[PDB]
Every structure is written in structure tokens, then in C-alpha cells.
From a paper:
To exert full kinase activity, MST1/2 and LATS1/2 requires coactivators, the scaffolding proteins Salvador homolog 1 (SAV1) and Mps One binder 1 (MOB1), respectively. Phosphorylated MOB1 protein is switched ON to increase the binding affinity to LATS1/2 and this binding accelerates auto-phosphorylation of the activation loop, A-loop (also referred to as activation segment or T-loop), of LATS1/2 kinases for full activation. The phosphorylation of MOB1 occurs at two threonine residues, Thr12 and Thr35, located at the N-terminal extension out of the C-terminal globular MOB core domain, and is required for binding to LATS/NDR kinases. Here we report the results of structural and biochemical studies of full-length mouse MOB1B in the autoinhibited form and that of the MOB core domain bound to the NTR region of LATS1 (hereafter referred to as the MOB1B-LATS1 complex).
Notablly, the SN strand forms a β-sheet with the S2 strand (residues 95-98). One zinc ion is coordinated by two cysteine (Cys79 and Cys84) and two histidine (His161 and His166) residues and linked to the H3-S1 loop and the C-terminal part of the H5 helix as found in the structures of other MOB proteins. The Switch helix-binding site on the MOB core domain is formed by helices H1, H2 and H7 and the H4-H5 loop, and is characterized by a conserved cluster of negative charges with nonpolar patches. Positively-charged His24 forms salt bridges with Glu51 and Glu55 and bifurcated hydrogen bonds to Glu51 to lock the Switch helix onto the MOB core domain. The phosphorylation residue of Switch helix (Thr35) is located at the edge of the interface with the MOB core domain and forms two hydrogen bonds to the helix main chains. Therefore, once phosphorylation occurs, phosphorylated Thr35 structurally inhibits binding of the Switch helix to the MOB core domain, which is consistent with previous reports that showed a critical role of Thr35 phosphorylation in LATS2 activation.
Residue numbers in the entry:
A (entry chain E), D (entry chain F): 3 to 10
B (entry chain A), C (entry chain C): 20 to 100, 106 to 211
The structure:
């Protein structure tokens, strides 16, 4: 299980 | 897939794209189980992007792609509650995670008579959101390997299929699609 | 199909039909083994017409179709070395025969490094000639079950794919296509 | 192995 984030 | 109706549904979905009207081809055939239709297409989008990423994986290395990028503006991270991954490390976690879901009998029952779980549309969304990123990283970072290998139409046509599909059944939000909304709108 | 390049070639072929330009989608990708490309598409046309015939097989019975018909003008027979069989008997022989070929390691090697036999284009032709007839019998004799089941676009788009494919690589002669040359030229 | 014929 992965918790994914994105950044700008 | 045992010559089952579910297998027919996959063949049905693939054949009907040849009309080139993807917007109609991706709709629920009348009287069909929604979950089943989404399931079948989710599985096929996975195999598709898997083979797609597979064609350029020699160009995607720890060196070439130190971070998980979608162009300069956009960068992804995994965590367990920030483990930074190279793109091929990130994508390995993503696809392994996705495979694992598809291999979970509680989520994608291999038995055609077993109903999908109550939250199935939710797991399908999460999967498809994540599969988007592999498309995004290919476009923004390896479109030239893709050109020289001549798997550009394959990538383009697979991605067009994916978008129309996912917009039809509300499987991906607008924020997720942002690193490719240029390419999208072009359609 | 093991995540092999051959499996990729199948996904490649299916995705690229979504452009709807079947005439280009069916051409040999540059540098690709001809035999392999034909093999992959032959196998998929078999699964396709198999699932297709499968949707209306309750409507195809010993009583409904006493002979192997392609409309009034055209009628097929099997013989060994003249055995009128009912359409479902004829089609069972045909598809079993075709399956058997695809299951023959000497003809369709399951091992990606093994060259196809010298006469491979010849066996592919014979198969595709025969697969035509199942399309022909469906159109001329069960198009109404097909309509009510809503597998008409599936049938039409599969058949359009098949024709363009087979014309591209010279796999079926003009005489064989005659019981459907109306529908054909229509697209 | 089948030998196939057609008529009209
Ligand atoms: Cl995520
Ligand atoms: Cl024959
Ligand atoms: Zn990369
Ligand atoms: Zn019949």
C-alpha cells in the first residue's frame, strides 16, 4: 500500500 | 477468462474500437454489469500500459530518471505515512501494487458468478489514477525512444482509449489529468 | 505469450485500431517478422469469431440450419479424402480444425525463438479462408439474433478488421469473399 | 483434416 503525492 | 462471457466482453471492447468512435465504443453495453465492464477494461489498460512501458524500459534507468517526473512542473512521491524513488523504482511499486489488486480474488474475483466488492469502483479509480502516471512519464520523458521504436501510435491510441474510458465512468479526477491536459484537449 | 514481444505485438495491433484507420493499423510494423505479425492476428481473429459465434449459438441449431449456408446462393460442404453437415456441425469441424492448427507447435511455435514453418503463410491462408465462412453464416443467417443481442458493432467492426487485414497480406482469394462482397465494398 | 467445397 502506497500513499502517493504530487508536487508542482 | 474461460470462454466466459467476461472474456467475450474483453473481445467486445477491443473489436468495437476499430470504428474509431471511442466515445461510443467505451459505453456500457445495455444490461451489462457496470463493475464487470470496468473490471475488464481496467485489466486491459494495465496489460497495455505494462507492455507499453516495457518497450522503453531500457531508456528508463536510475540515471536517466532520478526522480518520478511528469515534466518539470510535476513530480510524484511515494510514502508509507517521503521515500523518494527514481522513476523506474516508483513505477515498479505502482505496477506491482496494481497487479496485486488484479490478483486479489476479493477485489477482482476470478469466478464469474461472484459479485465484485462493495467498494469496487473505488479501487478501480485508484488503479486508473495511478496508471495515468505511467502514461504521463512516458510522454514527458521518453517520447523520443517511443518515436524511434514506432510505438507512438500504439501509445497515442492506447492513451486516447484510456481517457475516453475513464471520463465516461468518472474514474479519474481533473487534478490527476493535469500533467497532460494539453495532449488530452488536443482530442 | 509471457510478457514476450509477441504478446506486445498483439496489444500493439489491438490498440492501434482505435484510430479507426484500419488500412494503416494492419500493416507490418517496420522490421517486424511477417509470419509473427500474421500469426498474432490469426490467433486473435480466431478468438474473436469464436466468441462472436458463441453469442448466437443458441440460435444456430440442427433444426434452424440443416445445411451450411451463406444465404441461398452459397452452400458449403466437408468431405474426407460428400458429408452435408448442419451449419453447427460444419462450424464445429472448422473451428476444431483451426484450434488444432493453433495448438500445433510445428505450425504456431509456442516458443518465441523458434522460426515458423516454411509453409506458414499457406496454413494461415487456409485458416483465414475458413474463418470467413463463420462470418458469412452469421451475417446471412443470424443477423437478427445479433441485432437483439447488440453484438452488431462487435461483429461489424471485427469483420472490417478481418477484411482489411486479410487483403493487406493476401490471405484470402476473391472467390472466397463472394458471399459477402456486398457488405465488403460497403466499407 | 477437412476438404472443403462450396456451391451455388
Ligand atoms: Cl496515489
Ligand atoms: Cl476448405
Ligand atoms: Zn523514465
Ligand atoms: Zn446457423
Amino acid at each position: 500500500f502506497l500513499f502517493g503525492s504530487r508536487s508542482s
